[PDB]
Design an enzyme around this catalytic site. Sequence first.
Site, short mmCIF file in Angstrom:
data_model
loop_
_atom_site.label_atom_id
_atom_site.label_comp_id
_atom_site.label_asym_id
_atom_site.label_seq_id
_atom_site.Cartn_x
_atom_site.Cartn_y
_atom_site.Cartn_z
N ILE A 188 0.75 -1.18 0.14
CA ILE A 188 -0.20 -0.16 -0.06
C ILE A 188 1.06 1.44 -0.15
CG2 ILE A 188 -2.05 1.08 1.11
CD1 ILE A 188 -2.68 -1.53 -0.15
N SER B 150 5.19 2.94 1.58
CA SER B 150 6.13 2.90 2.44
C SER B 150 6.08 4.11 2.77
CB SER B 150 7.47 2.37 1.68
OG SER B 150 7.23 1.07 1.24
N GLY B 151 6.28 4.53 4.43
CA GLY B 151 6.27 5.71 4.87
C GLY B 151 7.65 5.84 5.55
N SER B 152 7.65 6.91 6.61
CA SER B 152 8.86 6.95 7.21
C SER B 152 9.22 5.91 8.20
CB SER B 152 8.61 8.39 8.20
OG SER B 152 8.46 9.56 7.20
N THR C 46 6.43 -0.19 6.04
CA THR C 46 5.71 -0.54 4.94
C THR C 46 4.23 -1.27 5.22
OG1 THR C 46 7.60 -0.17 3.66
CG2 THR C 46 5.64 -1.27 2.77
N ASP D 58 1.09 11.38 16.89
CA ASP D 58 1.34 11.62 15.50
C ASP D 58 0.03 11.78 14.70
OD1 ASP D 58 2.65 12.24 13.08
OD2 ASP D 58 3.19 10.26 12.85
C1 LIG Z 1 -6.28 1.62 2.43
N1 LIG Z 1 -5.87 1.14 3.83
C2 LIG Z 1 -6.83 0.31 4.23
N2 LIG Z 1 -6.67 -0.31 5.77
C3 LIG Z 1 -5.43 0.30 6.43
C4 LIG Z 1 -5.31 -0.39 7.66
C5 LIG Z 1 -4.09 0.02 8.32
C6 LIG Z 1 -3.20 0.95 7.58
N3 LIG Z 1 -1.92 1.40 8.45
C7 LIG Z 1 -1.67 0.75 9.92
C8 LIG Z 1 -1.15 -0.50 9.87
F1 LIG Z 1 -1.31 -1.32 8.99
C9 LIG Z 1 -0.93 -1.08 11.29
C10 LIG Z 1 -0.75 -0.39 12.16
C11 LIG Z 1 -1.16 1.00 12.18
N4 LIG Z 1 -1.39 1.85 13.27
S1 LIG Z 1 -1.34 1.34 14.84
O1 LIG Z 1 -0.20 0.46 14.98
O2 LIG Z 1 -1.24 2.37 15.85
N5 LIG Z 1 -2.50 0.37 14.84
C12 LIG Z 1 -3.70 1.05 15.21
C13 LIG Z 1 -4.25 -0.18 16.22
F2 LIG Z 1 -4.60 -0.24 17.58
C14 LIG Z 1 -2.62 -0.76 16.21
C15 LIG Z 1 -1.55 1.66 10.96
CL1 LIG Z 1 -2.12 3.24 10.89
C16 LIG Z 1 -3.30 1.22 6.48
CL2 LIG Z 1 -1.89 2.53 5.86
C17 LIG Z 1 -4.62 1.18 5.65
C18 LIG Z 1 -4.67 1.51 4.56
O3 LIG Z 1 -4.07 2.45 3.89
#
Ligand SMILES: Cn1cnc2ccc(Nc3c(F)ccc(NS(=O)(=O)N4CC(F)C4)c3Cl)c(Cl)c2c1=O
Length: 273
Positions: free
Chosen positions: A15, A17-19, A22, A128
């Site tokens: 989907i 790759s951020g800071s 990924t 953040d």
């Molecule tokens: C289009 N689409 C659809 N579904 C997504 C689902 C997740 C993420 N990103 C993501 C991740 F894969 C794991 C952990 C976290 N954040 S977290 O560790 O705080 N997490 C909150 C829980 F409590 C633990 C985040 Cl944000 C994305 Cl990027 C998408 C996305 O783009």
Amino acid sequence: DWEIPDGQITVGQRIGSGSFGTVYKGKWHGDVAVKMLNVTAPTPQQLQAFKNEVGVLRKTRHVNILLFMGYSTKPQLAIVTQWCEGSSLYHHLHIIETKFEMIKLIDIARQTAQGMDYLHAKSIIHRDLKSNNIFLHEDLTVKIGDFGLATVKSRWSGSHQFEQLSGSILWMAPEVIRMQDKNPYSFQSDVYAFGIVLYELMTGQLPYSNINNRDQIIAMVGAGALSPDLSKVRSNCPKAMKRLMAECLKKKRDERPLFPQILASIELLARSL
Ligand SMILES: Cn1cnc2ccc(Nc3c(F)ccc(NS(=O)(=O)N4CC(F)C4)c3Cl)c(Cl)c2c1=O
């Protein structure tokens, strides 16, 4: 236990790759998101620190918080969540320029405040909050993510802290830029980031879009000499929402409201539409 044994997750579409890691779409009892951490193999002490931060994630059970489902280690460190059907607010507002009605914009703000109020009630500082980690699931339900792994992201050597700054600067309270005051990360700095999300919803823009140079943004916001231009708020934004946005954006953190008050103001102006 919340560790997912290796071999059970099937990785799919990358989907982005951020800071800090990924994200891939994955399969594990259905669709999931898998965030691979962009970090060196942990030491035993770091592995324990990672599991302790997963302890924070585990405190969250709310429909406006992205659902933690499990973590991996033995492939490499990863956090698994539900898969959101839809896009992030950043994608809607700034990439595909979705045109939300004002009633929907206010509802997104309300749900985001609802999730942040829940986090703060569980004593979790997000650290953040920004629109590309606020997801609009099924085009209806806000899910807030990317609050996990605070010490991992900020303290570990090689965790791409320089790149994280570049990716977060627009939402960052002046006192988090400077890091000089006592406890720079606070409920109130989350409130400021939320005020910038309100600015995005109510203008359709990122703040400071007339200042090309992020290096001037960091210096000028940190010095207290730059703040978002609220004259860009759309004509149909309720006055009470503009007033609330200005309060959340106050340079002096002690002057910002906290989320029970924010939520109540939004609920009120939503009825008064
Ligand atoms: C289009 N689409 C659809 N579904 C997504 C689902 C997740 C993420 N990103 C993501 C991740 F894969 C794991 C952990 C976290 N954040 S977290 O560790 O705080 N997490 C909150 C829980 F409590 C633990 C985040 Cl944000 C994305 Cl990027 C998408 C996305 O783009």
